[PDB]
Amino acid sequence: SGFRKMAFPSGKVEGCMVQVTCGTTTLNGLWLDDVVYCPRHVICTNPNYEDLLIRKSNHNFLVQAGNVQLRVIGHSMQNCVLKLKVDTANPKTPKYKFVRIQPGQTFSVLACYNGSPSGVYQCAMRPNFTIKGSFLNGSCGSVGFNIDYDCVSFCYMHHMELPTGVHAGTDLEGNFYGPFVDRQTAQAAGTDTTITVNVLAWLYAAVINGDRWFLNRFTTTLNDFNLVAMKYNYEPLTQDHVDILGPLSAQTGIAVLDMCASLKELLQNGMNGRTILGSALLEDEFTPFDVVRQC
Amino acid sequence: SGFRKMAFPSGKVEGCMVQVTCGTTTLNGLWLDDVVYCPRHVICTNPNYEDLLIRKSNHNFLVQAGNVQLRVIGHSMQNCVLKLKVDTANPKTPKYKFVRIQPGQTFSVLACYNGSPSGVYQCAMRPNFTIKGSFLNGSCGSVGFNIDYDCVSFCYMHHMELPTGVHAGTDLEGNFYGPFVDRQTAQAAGTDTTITVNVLAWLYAAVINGDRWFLNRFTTTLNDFNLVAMKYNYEPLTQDHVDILGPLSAQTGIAVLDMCASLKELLQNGMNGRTILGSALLEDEFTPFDVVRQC
Numbered sequence: 125s126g127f128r129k130m131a132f133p134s135g136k137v138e139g140c141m142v143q144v145t146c147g148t149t150t151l152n153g154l155w156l157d158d159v160v161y162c163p164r165h166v167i168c169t170n171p172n173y174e175d176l177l178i179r180k181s182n183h184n185f186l187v188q189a190g191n192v193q194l195r196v197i198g199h200s201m202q203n204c205v206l207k208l209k210v211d212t213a214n215p216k217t218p219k220y221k222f223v224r225i226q227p228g229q230t231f232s233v234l235a236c237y238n239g240s241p242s243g244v245y246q247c248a249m250r251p252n253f254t255i256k257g258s259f260l261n262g263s264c265g266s267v268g269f270n271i272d273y274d275c276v277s278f279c280y281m282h283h284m285e286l287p288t289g290v291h292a293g294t295d296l297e298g299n300f301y302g303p304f305v306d307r308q309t310a311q312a313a314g315t316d317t318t319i320t321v322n323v324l325a326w327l328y329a330a331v332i333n334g335d336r337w338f339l340n341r342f343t344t345t346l347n348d349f350n351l352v353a354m355k356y357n358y359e360p361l362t363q364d365h366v367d368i369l370g371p372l373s374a375q376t377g378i379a380v381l382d383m384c385a386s387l388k389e390l391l392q393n394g395m396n397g398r399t400i401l402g403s404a405l406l407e408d409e410f411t412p413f414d415v416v417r418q419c
Numbered sequence: 420s421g422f423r424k425m426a427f428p429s430g431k432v433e434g435c436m437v438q439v440t441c442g443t444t445t446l447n448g449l450w451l452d453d454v455v456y457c458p459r460h461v462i463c464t465n466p467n468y469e470d471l472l473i474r475k476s477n478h479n480f481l482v483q484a485g486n487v488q489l490r491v492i493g494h495s496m497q498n499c500v501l502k503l504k505v506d507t508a509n510p511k512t513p514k515y516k517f518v519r520i521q522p523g524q525t526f527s528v529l530a531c532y533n534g535s536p537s538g539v540y541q542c543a544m545r546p547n548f549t550i551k552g553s554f555l556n557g558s559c560g561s562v563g564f565n566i567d568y569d570c571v572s573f574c575y576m577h578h579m580e581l582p583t584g585v586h587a588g589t590d591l592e593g594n595f596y597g598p599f600v601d602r603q604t605a606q607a608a609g610t611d612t613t614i615t616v617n618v619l620a621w622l623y624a625a626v627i628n629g630d631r632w633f634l635n636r637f638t639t640t641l642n643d644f645n646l647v648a649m650k651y652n653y654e655p656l657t658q659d660h661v662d663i664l665g666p667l668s669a670q671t672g673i674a675v676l677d678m679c680a681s682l683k684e685l686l687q688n689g690m691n692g693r694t695i696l697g698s699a700l701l702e703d704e705f706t707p708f709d710v711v712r713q714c
């Protein structure tokens with residue numbers, strides 16, 4: 125029993141983190157096989173990164189894997205990341221993939237400074253393509269990931285913090301999540317919404333854990349629910365979301381539309397001072413998979 | 420910016436987790452140098468563990484470090500843990516200590532099943548010596564730890580789940596946290612209280628992150644505050660707690676007793692639908708050190 129914000133074990137990723145310095149700029153890099161990936165921000169001083177990279181030599185890049193220096197033998201830019209070929213393949217390279225996630229999905233973040241991992245925590249990609257992370261100066265290049273069996277699916281590299289305190293980054297192919305750019309502008313996060321399918325998954329988690337006070341005998345229609353969800357700034361719930369919640373509906377014996385009626389009531393009346401799984405608000409950063417994995 | 424429940428990187432501990440089987444009972448063990456530590460529960464079938472262990476041979480213990488079997492060459496019981504001497508020292512042994520923590524302190528938990536790490540999350544030792552963990556069948560032997568520089572301070576080994584869904588375990592010397600025993604009784608968690616110094620540290624974290632709506636011009640006395648804290652089931656705040664909060668008080672320019680007046684108001688009036696650091700309730704599982712580490 126119990127339900128916590130649970131991250132994946134970070135060992136396999138810790139073995140891949142390195143430090144990258146170019147000029148007076150230092151940040152984190154990801155060392156997989158004979159390639160080090162890092163944000164192209166490291167060559168900064170409306171910049172034109174194509175020019176900046178042409179004006180650079182392999183010897184301008186100091187790559188340090190702990191107490192060992194790696195020799196850069198080739199550099200190239202892939203969108204907003206840099207690929208630095210090095211003369212040494214990482215002996216700790218796990219089986220891995222580069223995957224881009226969808227809004228509503230979760231991933232574990234290994235916050236790193238000067239190539240040294242500092243902490244690990246769970247994050248969700250918000251509907252507005254930001255993440256509510258925890259990052260200080262020097263965290264550029266920290267990566268987010270999931271694990272399936274033995275394979276590390278990298279999905280996020282950290283770049284910048286937006287004015288509202290939220291964070292923006294790219295996939296490992298260097299393509300930004302959301303309408304953000306790696307330069308100094310007035311860019312701000314767009315209006316966010318609540319991830320409805322996740323709130324429902326979390327309600328199932330509560331039931332599985334013996335928290336049932338919010339349940340009711342009623343059942344609603346998918347239409348009538350979405351009419352209420354939109355009013356409260358919730359994402360629309362689709363039939364695919366219902367099918368995805370299938371396994372949890374079976375384990376608990378509560379039909380999805382039955383749970384949706386409980387959610388509707390919670391939106392319209394609040395919690396009346398009660399809590400669900402130790403929370404006084406509806407949590408939406410647990411996916412259906414996250415619940416099954418932990419329950 | 421940002422504030423998350425952040426665990427320590429688990430790599431150094433992942434390399435120490437093994438599987439231990441005796442009879443049809445399998446659970447997790449901690450392999451450090453040439454010793455494997457695990458709960459004495461593994462020799463179970465008001466048991467008398469001294470008898471049970473006398474009736475066992477080194478060959479009755481199957482220890483598997485991944486795909487490699489370890490040969491047990493000696494066994495002994497230290498309170499509620501077992502020490503299984505093996506013919507092979509763990510080459511991945513980090514610098515480590517066995518430390519017992521105080522109620523109110525936090526630690527990272529690496530939940531493990533069949534010797535395989537599954538997830539990592541942050542926990543606090545409650546005033547009643549339970550932890551609100553996330554553990555399923557097979558999690559016996561999962562460990563909690565902190566990291567200081569390169570040294571892993573192990574502080575918890577998981578044993579059992581209590582009726583209310585909370586968890587009880589021991590330090591690595593086999594001594595239980597709280598008045599719990601490793602046998603089947605009606606034992607239940609005692610009444611819990613809120614960790615006041617932690618709530619204050621978390622309020623400082625909010626201020627450091629730009630959440631200031633709860634602040635007020637007032638300041639209270641340590642006496643007058645504790646009179647209110649006791650009413651709301653909060654731990655007493657001591658002058659040592661005030662001194663510990665010193666660094667955060669300096670960084671923010673808010674005297675501790677000034678923050679205590681904000682806390683008093685929050686207890687007496689609630690949050691009026693607002694949130695602090697994304698929470699609608701007063702969070703008490705962040706220590707002052709946790710805040711400094713992350714802010």
Ligand SMILES: *C(=O)c1ccc(OCc2ccccc2)cc1F
Nearest residue numbers: 163165264265283284306307308
């Ligand atoms: C770190 O990797 C990183 C990446 C992108 C950033 O974008 C904002 C910015 C501001 C000023 C100059 C260039 C880019 C910031 C970072 F820290």
Ligand SMILES: *C(=O)c1ccc(OCc2ccccc2)cc1F
Nearest residue numbers: 458460559560578579601602603
């Ligand atoms: C796992 O390691 C473990 C340890 C102690 C436990 O105590 C409860 C109990 C119940 C029945 C027989 C013996 C002990 C339970 C565990 F799972």
Ligand SMILES: [Br-]
Nearest residue numbers: 403404698699
């Ligand atoms: Br909350």
Ligand SMILES: [Mg+2]
Nearest residue numbers: 340342382385
């Ligand atoms: Mg219902």
Ligand SMILES: [Mg+2]
Nearest residue numbers: 635637677680
């Ligand atoms: Mg005040």
